[PDB]
Design a protein around this ligand. Structure first.
Ligand code: NDP
Ligand code: ZMP
Ligand code: SF4
Ligand code: SF4
Ligand code: SF4
Ligand code: ZN
Lengths: 114, 156, 146, 297, 95, 208, 176, 48
């Protein structure tokens, strides 16, 4: 049960790193919408940032959220430096994908998947 | 009529000039680049057909996709194809450009370059020989020879 | 070897009766709507159910809960078991209570009214193994089958 | 239902949607995005083409292998129409010209050819037929486009009685002739009111009309969510484009107000949320860049 | 030994032909369905049965190393000829 | 056993066993196992806290001088609780010899980066981040090197499928190369090839 | 057992220094390179006249696939699926059944020529010389699915190319 | 082949054909197997 840390000793320093990463993404989003000349708004990109942070909000392990902050900083570093193209930024927005059936009934209608 | 004859002769003229002066932009992705370089080597010599060696992408007529198209380079292929002036053509050289090939079931490979660009000639092989690639370029020239742009324009 | 019957005669699409009384292919919405419009009009003993020989327990409890929502307990099987006395209340009076493996522990087997060679061929194979190795005495009440 | 046309998969590129479509006029602005949205479900798209095969090449990455069948046809050859439609379960008509030519007037393109396609689709046993009229189609219209398109709508209705007839008002997109017409005009402002509809909304309307069994024999009116005057719409176009070929029939249609038909169903009755022009006009007119939104009514 | 369905479509040596109401015939519209017209089941039946004087015969298909692996066919049944499992050539004991 | 059998090299086997004893007794703080294969290669299995003390030693000791990092590797063995096996391959040009330094980690325990010992490792363990998700602490520029820029997951893990979860195609509607959940027109046909008979009785594991 | 490339200390007497200065000012090595290029100007080029002249090949050449037959019309393939088991790219798809005379024959023999790596493991796995990778390399298509060969296309390629394939196998089977 | 003729077989094409791609005589791929699952054809008589 005694494990080696990565950056954070507990969840407080970990949440601090999460909070700094959210700050950096929030600051970056208008520059991303400008220089990639995206067809979205700054509100919509910041909502996608908030969605990607609140997707992982159930995690209670400091090492896992350390690695999540590491991978989020790698995503941000690949976005600030123009290493992604427009395609890699817009892969967060699943635009060409048809909406999946969510209820039981339409999943019953379209096929065998649970 | 007379206009039908004139557009027939003018289509023959412009198709002669376009097929007899094809300029390739070769994507040297993978092993098929070496065999494209052998199709440019002095045994086969694409330049004797009017097919120049390494035209710049803003003035090329055909895009020869020679090698594996990975997912990390699929938008680069699409961007170069979008920057090509028309009439642009795309020759798919070898099995990875054709259908993914030996890396078809990979997590990182576009299964054939036809998912990204429209493809006119599929040259099969691993690698296809430089004679087989030159065969594909001559078949592309025969495809340009039977184009009917002004005739369909005169019938529209 | 009966797995090739699993690709003949197969029901692949929902079917309803047309205006002429014939089974025609239809969608799942139409078939389930035409069954639910009749199931809403039924209540009590108006709706019953016969479970067949190959039905999993999931569909059994599915159809039981569905007919219990319409207050119908009439859910029946094709194979008759007598409900006299305890009936299906205690599990012991309708199981092979010993085991298939417990045939190897027995020394007298009495068979009544069955042809276990074809009704349960590997239960019979276990009886023959106990016959051959444990010197099992078997008796039969019924027709003199092989 | 035949075993090869039962839908399989999860609705992706290698899936089977069970839709075998013959899309006439698939080489245009609407046919581009319709064959895109069909080919991504795994639909057998038959594209009959009139033009040079080069001008069809962009349709080829839109589906899986063997999922787009290109074949020659002619508007005045019913044999080629039958050769295109006799295996399909849906036929979509998108044949149109904004100008009349030497060989094809508005009556050929809008009255003769849609009636031919719909008659041969009726007698070949095609289940679903979708025809695209215009919202402002009227017999007493000032423009010959809308007159012949009303006549052709009436003939399509009387020769394929289950035809889903769709009324778009004015379609905008990257390859439109509505916002790109206003950006490259550098005619005036009048009392003309317009509600333009987005091309992906029209395409989702056509596919949801294929999938809906209620849409047989209906007439739909595909309109945008916001009605604009023509003047401040054109000023909004010159504002987004960072700015300070035609014919008189086109001008007669520009100065035709988009009529209000509340009794016809729209995109919401097929389940399509109509996208407003302020979300997509930047995407359309970014190319013309070398903004406060317009006022509705 | 090719034949034809009522749709006008050739039936292969396997026996594959599309149905009339199958849409997938549209791939041959304006093109051709490519079948091979040399059916092997009709060609091997043209070969005459080889009369031999032994009880067991060997068959390698002809050509030695160019044929199939050499197998040994028993010919005790006079009701049935003995067929090569690879090449389909059949043999009969002449006695 | 002359013509077709690989001839055993006993001198190199003896020398590598002796040098393995040498390393195991100079560094008992970190060395867990030392083994020499039948084709005469030395493996030094160490604790992951001693990546820098061992590899510096082999780089700098006058009887080691493993001045070359040939290769750096991870191996995913999921039945181990420390599922990743980090393999260093070192070359001594002075003593004309090769050594293998193996260690372990799981998904969450960082390995110390060996860039301060061998700069060669700068991309290699970076590849181990990209392919396996093994984090390397105090790496200069740790990021992906081989996968695409939006790639999720680590491909050379063995619970990662052969094809990915997404695939790309050009979409003409958005005028963009897009990523979609992967569908294959032909599924990769899994072949169960392993014979039910034992091949090598020298490698027989004891039963439970 | 080694040599030193570029370890010549140049002579510093007035002869050699004047030689290097004459090379610098009078461009002697540049004229040497021009002379070598001029010498290739008057050589016959190595260019063959394709399509009328063809590149040299050998009977081992691995080109377009073909299914072969016996010298009786019976096809050699007895459905053993060794070619699709050895196939490194899984280009071969085989389904089989006993046909009307009880022979073990295929009903599906697909080769995706756009997965195929043209390595010929299938023709050396094949125990009856049924699949071969023949001599044709000039079979480029205008469409992707024209390179998705079924059994009919491979049998037609065998019937088309057998007169050449059999002579190439006759040339090479003693090395196999 | 004027000196050493090829070995004559009855199944070898007597007419060679060139590359037929792009013509109406071109190869179109298809599945060569028959139908796997058989469907239940309902009775054409009424059921009352
Ligand atoms: N805003 C809009 O564009 C609106 C459009 N519509 C209707 O929607 C349909 C599609 O519109 P849109 O994409 O803009 O049209 P396009 O002008 O972009 O293309 C129309 C298509 O029809 C084909 N076609 C035209 N005339 C003929 C003919 N005589 N014979 C054969 N084919 C012919 C063209 O083929 P080819 O490439 O060979 O020329 C093209 O593929 C039309 O019917 C139009 O009237 C309705 C309301 C609004
Ligand atoms: C253009 C698109 C941009 C895409 C951007 C992708 C970046 C994704 C980065 C993801 C990094 C994370 O998810 S780290 C979050 C993990 N944290 C945890 O699991 C701990 C729980 N965290 C929370 O609840 C967080 O909301 C807070 C803010 C730390 C605390 O909130 P609660 O208190 O109320
Ligand atoms: S098709 Fe094959 S030989 Fe050709 S570039 Fe691809 S991997 Fe190399
Ligand atoms: S040549 Fe190789 S890749 Fe091609 S089908 Fe044969 S075994 Fe498979
Ligand atoms: S081609 Fe040869 S290896 Fe392949 S299934 Fe047929 S007989 Fe076996
Ligand atoms: Zn034989």
């Amino acid at each position: 049960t005694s494990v080696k840390p990565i950056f954070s000793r507990d969840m407080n320093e970990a949440k601090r790193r999460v909070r700094e990463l959210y700050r950096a993404w929030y600051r970056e989003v208008p520059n991303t919408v400008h220089l990639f000349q995206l067809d979205i708004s700054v509100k919509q990109g910041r909502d996608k940032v908030r969605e990607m942070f609140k997707k992982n909000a159930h995690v209670t392990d400091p090492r896992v959220v350390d690695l999540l902050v590491i991978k989020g900083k790698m995503e941000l570093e690949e976005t600030i430096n123009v290493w992604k193209q427009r395609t890699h930024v817009m892969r967060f927005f699943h635009e060409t994908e048809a909406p999946r059936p969510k209820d039981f009934l339409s999943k019953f209608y379209v096929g065998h998947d649970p | 009529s007379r206009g039908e004859y004139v557009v027939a002769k003018l289509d023959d003229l412009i198709n002669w000039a376009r097929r007899s002066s094809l300029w390739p932009m070769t994507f040297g992705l993978a092993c098929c680049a070496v065999e494209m370089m052998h199709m440019a080597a002095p045994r086969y010599d694409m330049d004797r057909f009017g097919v120049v060696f390494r035209a710049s992408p803003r003035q090329s007529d055909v895009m020869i996709v020679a090698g594996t198209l990975t997912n990390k380079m699929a938008p680069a292929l699409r961007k170069v194809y979008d920057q090509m002036p028309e009439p642009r053509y795309v020759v798919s050289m070898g099995s990875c450009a054709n259908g993914g090939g030996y890396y078809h079931y990979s997590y990182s490979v576009v299964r054939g370059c036809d998912r990204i660009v429209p493809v006119d000639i599929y040259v099969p092989g691993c690698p296809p020989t430089a004679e087989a690639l030159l065969y594909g370029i001559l078949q592309l020239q025969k495809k340009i020879k039977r184009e009917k742009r002004l005739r369909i324009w005169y019938r529209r | 070897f009966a797995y090739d019957g699993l690709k003949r005669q197969r029901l692949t699409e929902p079917m309803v009766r047309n205006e002429k009384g014939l089974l025609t292919h239809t969608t799942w919405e139409d078939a389930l709507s035409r069954v639910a419009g009749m199931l809403q009009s039924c209540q009590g003993n108006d709706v019953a159910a016969i479970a067949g020989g190959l039905v999993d327990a999931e569909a059994l409890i599915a159809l039981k809960d569905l007919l219990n929502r319409v207050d119908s307990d009439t859910l029946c099987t094709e194979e008759v078991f007598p409900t006299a006395g305890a009936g299906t209340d205690l599990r012991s009076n309708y199981l092979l209570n010993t085991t298939i493996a417990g045939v190897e522990e027995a020394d007298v087997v009495l068979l009544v009214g069955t042809n276990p060679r074809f009704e349960a061929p590997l239960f019979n194979a276990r009886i023959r193994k106990s016959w051959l190795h444990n010197d099992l005495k078997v008796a039969l009440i019924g027709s003199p089958v092989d | 239902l035949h075993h090869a046309v039962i839908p399989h998969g999860k609705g992706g590129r290698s899936s089977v949607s069970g839709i075998v479509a013959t899309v006439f006029g698939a080489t245009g602005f609407l046919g581009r995005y319709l064959v895109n949205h069909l080919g991504r479900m795994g639909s057998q798209v038959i594209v009959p083409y009139r033009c040079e095969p080069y001008d069809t090449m962009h349709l080829r990455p839109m589906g899986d292998l063997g999922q787009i069948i290109f074949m020659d046809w002619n508007g005045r050859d019913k044999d080629s129409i039958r050769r295109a439609v006799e295996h399909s379960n849906v036929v979509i008509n998108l044949v149109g010209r904004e100008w009349e030519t030497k060989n094809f007037d508005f009556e050929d393109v809008f009255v003769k050819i849609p009636q031919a396609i719909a008659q041969v689709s009726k007698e070949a046993g095609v289940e679903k037929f979708i025809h695209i009229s215009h919202l402002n189609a009227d017999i007493k219209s000032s423009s010959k486009y809308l007159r012949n398109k009303a006549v052709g709508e009436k003939e399509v209705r009387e020769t394929f009685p289950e035809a889903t007839i769709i009324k778009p008002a004015d379609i905008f997109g990257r390859e439109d002739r509505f916002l790109n017409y206003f950006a490259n005009i550098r005619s005036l402002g009048k009392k003309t009111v317009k509600q333009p509809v987005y091309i992906v909304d029209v395409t989702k309307g056509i596919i949801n009309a294929i999938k809906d069994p209620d849409a047989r024999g209906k007439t739909f009116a595909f309109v945008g969510p916001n009605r604009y005057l023509l003047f401040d719409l054109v000023q909004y176009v010159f504002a987004v484009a960072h700015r300070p070929w035609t014919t008189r029939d086109k001008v007669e249609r520009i100065h035709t107000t988009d009529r209000t038909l509340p009794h016809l169903p729209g995109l919401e009755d097929l389940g399509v949320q109509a996208t407003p022009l302020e979300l997509k006009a930047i995407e359309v007119l970014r190319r013309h860049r070398t903004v406060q939104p317009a006022k509705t009514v | 030994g090719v034949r034809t369905s009522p749709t006008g479509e050739k039936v292969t040596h396997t026996g594959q032909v599309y149905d009339d109401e199958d849409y997938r015939r549209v791939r041959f519209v304006g093109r051709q369905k490519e079948v091979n017209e040399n059916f092997a089941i009709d060609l091997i039946a043209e070969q005459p049965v080889s009369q031999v004087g032994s009880r067991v015969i060997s068959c390698d298909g002809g050509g030695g190393a160019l044929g199939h692996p050499r197998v040994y066919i028993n010919l005790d049944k006079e009701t049935k000829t003995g067929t090569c499992g690879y090449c389909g050539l059949q043999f009969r004991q002449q006695h | 056993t002359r013509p077709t059998v690989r001839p055993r090299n006993d001198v190199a086997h003896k020398q590598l066993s002796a040098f393995g004893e040498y390393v195991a007794e100079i560094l008992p703080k970190y060395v867990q196992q030392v083994q020499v294969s039948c084709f005469s290669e030395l493996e030094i299995c160490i604790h992951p806290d001693g990546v820098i003390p061992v590899l510096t030693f082999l780089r700098d000791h006058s009887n080691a001088q493993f001045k070359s990092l040939a290769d750096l590797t991870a191996v995913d063995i999921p039945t181990r609780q420390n599922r990743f096996e980090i393999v260093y391959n070192l070359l001594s040009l002075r003593f004309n010899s090769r050594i293998r330094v193996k260690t372990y980690t799981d998904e969450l325990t960082p390995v110390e980066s060996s860039v301060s010992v061998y700069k060669a490792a700068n991309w290699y363990e970076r590849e181990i981040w990209d392919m396996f998700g093994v984090f390397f602490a105090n790496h200069p520029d740790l990021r992906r090197i081989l996968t695409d820029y939006g790639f999720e997951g680590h491909p050379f893990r063995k619970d990662f499928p052969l094809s990915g979860y997404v695939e790309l195609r050009y979409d003409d509607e958005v005028k963009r190369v897009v990523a979609e959940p992967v569908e294959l027109a032909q599924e990769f046909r899994k072949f169960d090839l392993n014979s039910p008979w034992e091949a090598f009785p020298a490698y027989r594991q004891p039963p439970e | 057992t080694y040599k030193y490339v570029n370890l010549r200390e140049p002579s510093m007497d007035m002869k050699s220094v004047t030689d290097r200065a004459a090379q610098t000012l009078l461009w002697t090595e540049l004229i040497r390179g021009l002379g070598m290029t001029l010498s290739y100007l008057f050589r016959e080029p190595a260019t063959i006249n394709y399509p009328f002249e063809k590149g040299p090949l050998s009977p081992r050449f691995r080109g377009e696939h073909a299914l072969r037959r016996y010298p009786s019309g019976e096809e050699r393939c007895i459905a053993c699926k060794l070619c699709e088991a050895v196939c490194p790219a899984q280009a071969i798809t085989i389904e089989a059944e006993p046909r009307a005379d009880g022979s073990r024959r295929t009903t599906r023999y697909d080769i995706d020529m756009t997965k195929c790596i043209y390595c010929g493991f299938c023709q050396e796995a094949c125990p009856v010389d049924a699949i071969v990778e023949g001599p044709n390399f000039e079979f480029s298509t205008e469409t992707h699915e024209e390179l998705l060969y079924n059994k009919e296309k491979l049998l037609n390629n065998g019937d088309k190319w057998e007169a050449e394939i059999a002579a190439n196998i006759q040339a090479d089977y003693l090395y196999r | 082949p004027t000196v050493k003729p090829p070995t004559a077989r009855k199944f070898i094409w007597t007419n060679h054909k060139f590359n037929l791609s792009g013509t109406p005589q071109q190869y179109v791929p298809y599945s060569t197997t028959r139908k796997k699952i058989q469907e239940w054809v309902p009775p054409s008589t009424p059921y009352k």
